[PDB]
Amino acid sequence: KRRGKVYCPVCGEDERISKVEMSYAFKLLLDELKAMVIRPSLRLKDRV
């Protein structure tokens, strides 16, 4: 918010970032998987 910009720290990619609506429980599950040394890669798809 201070910089006002969205970027991927592991990768860079200051341009190709998309907003995804999902449950906060799913975000917590992804955080748990990352803490368990598991990398979930979300392959985004167009809504149409």
Hey, what are 11's tokens?
């990768």
Q: At closest approach, how far in Å is the CB of 6 from Zn ion?
A: 11
Residue nearest to Zn ion (CB): 11
8: annotated binding-site residue? yes
15: annotated binding-site residue? no
Q: Closest CB to Zn ion among 14 and 31?
A: 14
Please report where in the chains the tokens 């720290």 appear, as a residue: 9
Q: Assess contact for 20 and 44: CB atoms under 8 A.
A: yes
Where along the sequence are the contacts to Zn ion (CB under 5 A)? 8, 11, 13
Annotated binding-site residues for Zn(2+) read 8, 11, 13
